[PDB]
Amino acid sequence: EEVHKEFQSLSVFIDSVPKKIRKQKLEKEMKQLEHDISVIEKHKIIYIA
């Protein structure tokens, strides 16, 4: 949420370059966290090494 709430808090019109980079930083975290929760829901059993 806090990443997406930050994504939600974001300005709608993004004209400046330092805005345009700080959009991506969240999306790098956003893709990462979604990937992790996706794979742990695949099975309940976690046989790991």
Binding site: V39, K42, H43, I45, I46, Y47, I48
Partner: peptide, 11 residues
């Protein structure tokens, strides 16, 4: 039917 993750990934 089991997730397998590497140790570096888990850390």
């Amino acid at each position: 039917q089991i997730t397998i993750i590497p140790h570096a990934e888990w850390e």
